Amino acid sequence: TVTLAGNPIEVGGHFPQVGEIVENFILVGNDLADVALNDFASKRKVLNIFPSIDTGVCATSVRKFNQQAAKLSNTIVLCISADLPFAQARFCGAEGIENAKTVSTFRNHALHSQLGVDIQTGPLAGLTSRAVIVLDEQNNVLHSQLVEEIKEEPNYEAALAVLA
Amino acid sequence: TVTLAGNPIEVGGHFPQVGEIVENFILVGNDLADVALNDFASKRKVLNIFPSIDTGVCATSVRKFNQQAAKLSNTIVLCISADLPFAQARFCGAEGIENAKTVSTFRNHALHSQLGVDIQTGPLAGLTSRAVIVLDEQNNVLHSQLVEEIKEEPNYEAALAVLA
C-alpha cells in the first residue's frame, strides 16, 4: 500500500509491529567497519530508514528529527540505507549530531526484507522503503511506521512521544 | 591473488580472460533506469570497474582514460561500481563524456562474481575489485586486467592499445 509520488510500489517482508522484538543485525559504518545492532547494548535505538540519504539537497524536517531524537536520554539514532559508506559519510542529516550515525546495508541487502522495507518494483527496487522504527534498550518495538508515501514526512512526533 | 595495501583480499568469480566472450548483463543508470550490455550491441566496450567512484579523491588520470577510450571509434565506456546511482553522478571520470556512462550493481550483486571481481573479505567486501575489461564488437575479450593492487593505477595504455 506504499506509493512513490502517488505511484504504487511493492514493499516486501514483515514490517516490525509494536511489542515485537527486532533481531540482531549487522551493517557497515562510515569507516567500512561492521556495526551490529547489539553494539549499542542497553540503549534505545531509533532506526531511521531511507531509500537514499544522498538525494542531494539535504532535508530539514529530517535533520530536525535526528537532532531531537539523539538529544534524548540514552538513545542512538541509526540512519539506515543502501547508500555505500562513502556516500553516507556525507549525509547532512546527522553530521554534527553526536548520537546520530549512518550505517549501510550494501553487503546485507537481506536486511531489507527482514525489516519489511524491501522495495521490489520501480526505479527504487533494491532500496529500503522509508520507515521509522523505535526500539527500547531490549530491542522491543516501542513504535514503528512504514510511510505510505515515500516523498511524505513521517510521523516524527509519534516516534518521539514514545521515547519519553 | 589481489591485495589491498599489501594485505591480500579474496576476490571470487572467474575473471574474463582474452579468448573468452562476456555475456549480457543488466545494471542501473544514473536515472535509475536499467542499462544492459546488449544496449550497445555491435560496438566496442570498455568495462572500467571500481571498488567505488565516490571515494572523495578523484585522479585526473581516471577521467583522462575515459575520455581517450570514449573518443575511439565505435567504443562505449562503462564505469561500473556498487555505488548507488545518486553517487555515481558525483564521479569526475564520466560526467561530460558522451560515450562514457556510469552504471550501478546495487540491484545486481550477482554481476560481481560473474565478472570475477567479487571482493568477499576485508572492509571492501561487497564491492567490485578494480579492473579494466576491453570487449570487441562481439563481446570477445581483447584485453583484461584485474589490478593486483587496488591502490595501483591500471595499465591504461594496454587497454587503449587493443582498441587502436
From Swiss-Prot, chains A, B:
InterPro entries in the record = Redoxin (IPR013740), Thioredoxin-like_sf (IPR036249), Thioredoxin_domain (IPR013766), TPX (IPR002065), Tpx_CS (IPR018219), Tpx_Peroxidase_subfamily (IPR050455)
Sorted UniProt keywords: Antioxidant, Disulfide bond, Oxidoreductase, Peroxidase, Redox-active center
Q: Which cysteines are joined by disulfide bonds?
A: 58-92, 58-92
Q: Name one GO molecular function term.
A: thioredoxin peroxidase activity
The Thioredoxin domain covers 16-164
Q: What is its EC number?
A: 1.11.1.24
Pfam name, any one: Redoxin
User: Which residues constitute the catalytic centre?
Assistant: 58 (cysteine sulfenic acid (-soh) intermediate)
Q: Which reaction does it catalyse?
A: a hydroperoxide + [thioredoxin]-dithiol = an alcohol + [thioredoxin]-disulfide + H2O
In this entry, which stretches build a coiled coil?
none
The UniProt family comment states: Belongs to the peroxiredoxin family. Tpx subfamily.
Cited function:
Thiol-specific peroxidase that catalyzes the reduction of hydrogen peroxide and organic hydroperoxides to water and alcohols, respectively. Plays a role in cell protection against oxidative stress by detoxifying peroxides.
What's the further remark here? The active site is a conserved redox-active cysteine residue, the peroxidatic cysteine (C(P)), which makes the nucleophilic attack on the peroxide substrate. The peroxide oxidizes the C(P)-SH to cysteine sulfenic acid (C(P)-SOH), which then reacts with another cysteine residue, the resolving cysteine (C(R)), to form a disulfide bridge. The disulfide is subsequently reduced by an appropriate electron donor to complete the catalytic cycle. In this atypical 2-Cys peroxiredoxin, C(R) is present in the same subunit to form an intramolecular disulfide.
Subunit structure of this chain's protein: Homodimer.
Q: What is this protein called?
A: Thiol peroxidase
Native organism taxonomy: Bacteria, Pseudomonadati, Pseudomonadota, Gammaproteobacteria, Pasteurellales
Gene name for this UniProt entry: tpx
